[PDB]
Scaffold this active site. Sequence first.
Site, PDB file in Angstrom:
ATOM      1  N   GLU A 222      43.588  49.097  44.256  1.00 56.21           N
ATOM      2  CA  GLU A 222      42.726  48.995  43.092  1.00 56.21           C
ATOM      3  C   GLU A 222      41.396  48.465  43.615  1.00 56.21           C
ATOM      4  O   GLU A 222      41.361  47.449  44.331  1.00 56.21           O
ATOM      5  CB  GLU A 222      43.325  48.136  42.006  1.00 56.21           C
ATOM      6  CG  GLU A 222      42.610  48.284  40.662  1.00 56.21           C
ATOM      7  CD  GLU A 222      42.934  47.111  39.751  1.00 56.21           C
ATOM      8  OE1 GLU A 222      43.111  45.977  40.285  1.00 56.21           O
ATOM      9  OE2 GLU A 222      43.050  47.315  38.518  1.00 56.21           O
TER      10      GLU A 222
ATOM     11  N   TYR B 166      49.056  49.084  33.241  1.00 50.81           N
ATOM     12  CA  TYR B 166      48.709  47.811  33.802  1.00 50.81           C
ATOM     13  C   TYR B 166      49.278  46.755  32.869  1.00 50.81           C
ATOM     14  O   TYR B 166      48.744  46.522  31.795  1.00 50.81           O
ATOM     15  CB  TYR B 166      47.201  47.676  33.912  1.00 50.81           C
ATOM     16  CG  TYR B 166      46.741  46.531  34.786  1.00 50.81           C
ATOM     17  CD1 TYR B 166      47.126  45.197  34.518  1.00 50.81           C
ATOM     18  CD2 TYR B 166      45.923  46.764  35.880  1.00 50.81           C
ATOM     19  CE1 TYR B 166      46.661  44.156  35.292  1.00 50.81           C
ATOM     20  CE2 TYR B 166      45.477  45.715  36.668  1.00 50.81           C
ATOM     21  CZ  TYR B 166      45.862  44.418  36.366  1.00 50.81           C
ATOM     22  OH  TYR B 166      45.414  43.376  37.121  1.00 50.81           O
TER      23      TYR B 166
ATOM     24  N   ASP C 215      36.287  39.157  34.247  1.00 49.24           N
ATOM     25  CA  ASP C 215      36.658  38.595  35.532  1.00 49.24           C
ATOM     26  C   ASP C 215      36.504  37.095  35.628  1.00 49.24           C
ATOM     27  O   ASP C 215      35.512  36.526  35.132  1.00 49.24           O
ATOM     28  CB  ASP C 215      35.914  39.326  36.642  1.00 49.24           C
ATOM     29  CG  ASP C 215      36.505  40.718  36.894  1.00 49.24           C
ATOM     30  OD1 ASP C 215      37.693  40.781  37.355  1.00 49.24           O
ATOM     31  OD2 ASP C 215      35.798  41.725  36.620  1.00 49.24           O
TER      32      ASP C 215
END
EC number: 4.2.1.20
Lengths: 395, 395, 255, 255
Positions: free
Chosen positions: D49, D175, D60
Amino acid sequence: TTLLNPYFGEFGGMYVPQILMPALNQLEEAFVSAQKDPEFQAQFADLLKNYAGRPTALTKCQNITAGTRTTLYLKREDLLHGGAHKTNQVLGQALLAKRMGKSEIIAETGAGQHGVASALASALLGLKCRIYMGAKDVERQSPNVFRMRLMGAEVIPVHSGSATLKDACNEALRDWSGSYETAHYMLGTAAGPHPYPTIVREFQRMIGEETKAQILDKEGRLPDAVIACVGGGSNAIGMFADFINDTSVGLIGVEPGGHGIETGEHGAPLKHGRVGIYFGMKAPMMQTADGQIEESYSISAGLDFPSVGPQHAYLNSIGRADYVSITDDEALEAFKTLCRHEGIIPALESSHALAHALKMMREQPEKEQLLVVNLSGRGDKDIFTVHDILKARGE
Amino acid sequence: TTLLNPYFGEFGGMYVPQILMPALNQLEEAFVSAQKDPEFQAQFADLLKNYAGRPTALTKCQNITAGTRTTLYLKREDLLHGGAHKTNQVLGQALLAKRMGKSEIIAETGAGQHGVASALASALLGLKCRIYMGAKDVERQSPNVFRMRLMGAEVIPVHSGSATLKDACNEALRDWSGSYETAHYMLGTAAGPHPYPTIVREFQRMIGEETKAQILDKEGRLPDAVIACVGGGSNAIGMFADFINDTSVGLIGVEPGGHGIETGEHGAPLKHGRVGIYFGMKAPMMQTADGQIEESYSISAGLDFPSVGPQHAYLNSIGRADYVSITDDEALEAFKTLCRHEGIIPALESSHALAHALKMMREQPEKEQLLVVNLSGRGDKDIFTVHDILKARGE
Amino acid sequence: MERYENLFAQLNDRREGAFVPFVTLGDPGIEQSLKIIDTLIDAGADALELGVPFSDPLADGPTIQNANLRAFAAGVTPAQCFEMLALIREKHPTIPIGLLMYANLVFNNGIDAFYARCEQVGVDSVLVADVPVEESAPFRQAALRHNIAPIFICPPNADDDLLRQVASYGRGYTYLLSRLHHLIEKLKEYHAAPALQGFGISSPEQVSAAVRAGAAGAISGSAIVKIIEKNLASPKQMLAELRSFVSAMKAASRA
Amino acid sequence: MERYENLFAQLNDRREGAFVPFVTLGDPGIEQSLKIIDTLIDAGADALELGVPFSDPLADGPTIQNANLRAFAAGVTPAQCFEMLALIREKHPTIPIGLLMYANLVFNNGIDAFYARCEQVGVDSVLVADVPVEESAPFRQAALRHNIAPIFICPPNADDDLLRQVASYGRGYTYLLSRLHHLIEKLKEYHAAPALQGFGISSPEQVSAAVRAGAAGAISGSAIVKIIEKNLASPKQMLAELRSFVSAMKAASRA
Ligand SMILES: O=C(NCCOP(=O)(O)O)c1ccc(OC(F)(F)F)cc1
Ligand SMILES: O=C(NCCOP(=O)(O)O)c1ccc(OC(F)(F)F)cc1
Ligand SMILES: *Cc1c(COP(=O)(O)O)cnc(C)c1O
Ligand SMILES: *Cc1c(COP(=O)(O)O)cnc(C)c1O
Ligand code: NA
Ligand code: NA
């Protein structure tokens, strides 16, 4: 000979050089006429409403009084245009100046709020404004000095005597004594020679009138007490005036106790000064034992008038009003508390009034009391002052 | 699935990580419920009135327009508690947070006004407030930082990316994504993911509603145009919303032109940016050619949102609203002019709107026009900025 | 005591106007101020007008403001002023001595005790700068009880009521403010104390002009103080310049 | 191309989970990043990834924020990222390569042209971090037209509607966001792409735990980037530490 009484009991009068008496009699006549003139009143009411932002809010302070039997309201003069109550009376005095055919304004200022107020009124109403400010004050009050200049006023530093408010007050009078045919002297508080204490009261009285209507509306009764800080006396007389004949309503004025009465470093002449004659009036003042005029000390520069309005001295003498004092530290605490608990940054001047109401509450927390504090101004101006104290005291 | 349309034409949406979608749907549901709840509305109206000081004045500016056929009114959001319009919507969002059972508030801020507004709302309503502010901004905005602290808020410096508003906006979202069960994210403008553009419009719409009532009262007709500065879009949508269906009323939004559009040093993404997807929405934004997000530049730090509310982009696309830009110098002149001619110190943000109205007047002085400028805030905060320019340019 | 009355009778006999200088007591210090006053007398001053340093002289221009500052710098107090006045009277038995006071200094520790103190040191008159006739009752009554003349300013624009009050209430002399033939004649008509013209009197031709107009003489303030201020660096030069100016001014009063 | 399908068939045959590291392209510079990726592959990464540096990575944590800053410091652009991707594919024909993108970088110069570019460099999937399923139509359609798998996050609290959408719309792998047995089984029930668990996966026991739970394997992000960050001063030490961590993590997937 005058049309109105220049005295409040023993206090007040017109202690000015003979050359200035025609100016005062002229001004009194114009005022009496204006007070009878519906068109003047309508013009004044219109500027208050549509320019200054009246009526101002009456705010209930629930967080502050939690767990006590005190209900506390703040009269929101901090929300008036210019951020303090002074705007009310400069608009009326400006309108008087125009009524008399004057095209220039003289004003004194200490901390600068009165200078700013006079400058904005003049800019609005097309008057040429000059402002006297003691040299030490010019030095200490850069933000207000630049506000005055941006508004087109001429700021004149005064170097004589102590280079402070006392000395700007003298210079204003000296200028007016030669210029009064064309210039009006826009005095900044409810003090000085008649007719100024009366004029300034009447041009601030909407404070108490609104407060009475608003408290009747919200609580259905009059306050047990109204509390206001006393520098020269304008905000406090503005709050008190409409309640004087409501004899159950306490009127409490709060003078600055500075470092503490016992230190002598204070600004509480009404209760701790001695009657003298100065600035056109008979009033309690800060003075030496042989009668030289002294400065008032407070953390709050706006409470530095070294005397007090003669109506206050009178109201005290007959027991209609009570006067107290609040120290720098008590004022700082009340400032901190309002910011943290109500999200309102109060002027350090106004914080003296609040500090007293917090005392009334804290000392007797199960006393049923309905209080109004006149929040005479906003405290944006005081944020560095309160920073550099809570910096120098660690915290 | 949502209850309300998250798009204004092509613009808007909910471009957030999947983990944040429940937070947004929860918030939308609470809002739809609140908007139907007379008790919510009454509580919100009460804080606006008795705490914030609504309604705000509508001031006619006679000196400024002398010798032209322009009549100019200023909507006085400068007189709102906290000194800018942002106070309106933080009180509504605070009330929403309480309705959802949240006890903590997250807010981003650039120049600090939104941080101050969120901090005062939280202090009033007993919410624990944390504020993200880019490290460069913390450095540049000491006065607002100390206001936030005095009001009990926790100020968290953001060091990532450009250490500015963009980067505080990301950090607010990252925090909320893990804390939304207990914390509400009090977004500071009419932008970001749905439902925020809609909520903020609806909690600012009293600006235009009051303006319409006040202008009908004073002039007996609607304005030919209403003009507001556009940073993120909140003050402008607050002014515009009630006029959208009054198709004769022009809606003009003014983006900051900074040093000039042609310099590239500006904050005018609606007219000079490119549509992108960022901060939860599809909108015009300041971005590099390969799609990195850039900063907006203005002399006025409050107009530094590098995008714009999606409703503005939509209103522009269908030709309902027109968007223009005003340079630092044009804004400075309008600032100077208001101080000197009206005795009102306007925010440099608000000065962009005024500068545009002065252009409309000066360019065509015999055009009959009735204009309202949203005076979104007061400019006490800007007095040194305007000093150090008229110092560095001699004057 | 009748010192102004005796002076004005003596001056009229000699077809002469009064010349009356003003100085601030204790400017630039007590010892030098005493020498200054002795020099003004030796040079031909008919009478003296003497200021007591006050913190806020709101009737005074910059020159007098500075004199006060100078006296305060030397630590001069009203008590020291009164000791000085006693010494001055004791050297010069007949010269009228007038004070120029601010109200607070008169009122401070009792109006009546202030005028009693003036009587004891042998002062003849007191002009209280910020007491208009309207406010003057307790001052002029106290003065008269203590054989002190209360002096009043007659301003350049006085209406008839004001002229009548100034005429009725004043003694010693009427202080005729410069900033004209109508005022002098009405004052005479109402039997006012003889008029002395003051404010901006700085040249000998102003003195002759005053007397010609029908004023009994001239008061010169700032001009004398300006000479002090100009000569601070040189005390001897100061007296000599003072001597010269005074005799010039006084000669002009000899009609 | 069917690289995830081929990998998952091959892994299932060997009773093995996937180990999938995340790194930011061009952290700490292009040349070193290429060596880092080659080391992850040599050490046993089943798939990659790969993040493209974006100015505002609002999904993030600090570790990835710093990786971006490092790449930007080296002047890394999405165009350079795509040149890197071409080189990587050309060295390693079968390893699935997934991108982790922010919407603006996909949308910027046309969603359709972005996915066409992914197809040309031999990318297998794209997860767009700030595109929820609700907003995904034009992204997942563009991806599928260009033989790219659109990956969706299945968050820890997904209601049934969300599970059904993620199952329907995703390809390649789901995911599965850490911050459990219910989600894996429903995803299987709705025939979702095989689930990879990610977010906080930093130890070999987490990898075995994921596979035991019924996930097809584990994604580890920050852990790999932390090793980069810790070893900036020493590129050789960096690869060796990366090599060690990857093989440890991969061994744990062998059930
Ligand atoms: O005699 C005075 N000083 C000197 C005057 O002479 P000059 O200094 O030349 O004007 C003098 C007299 C009165 C006075 O106050 C007021 F008029 F208000 F009563 C102030 C100064
Ligand atoms: O795979 C990712 N990075 C590394 C994850 O591992 P770790 O860094 O250990 O949490 C990753 C995946 C998706 C993401 O955004 C969102 F969830 F919103 F779609 C952000 C990071
Ligand atoms: C100037 C000022 C005062 C004191 O003046 P008063 O005449 O005694 O009211 C009090 N509060 C504020 C906010 C001021 O600016
Ligand atoms: C923050 C701010 C603005 C810009 O924000 P909008 O959301 O675009 O209104 C404008 N004016 C003032 C006074 C501000 O504080
Ligand atoms: Na006082
Ligand atoms: Na913008």
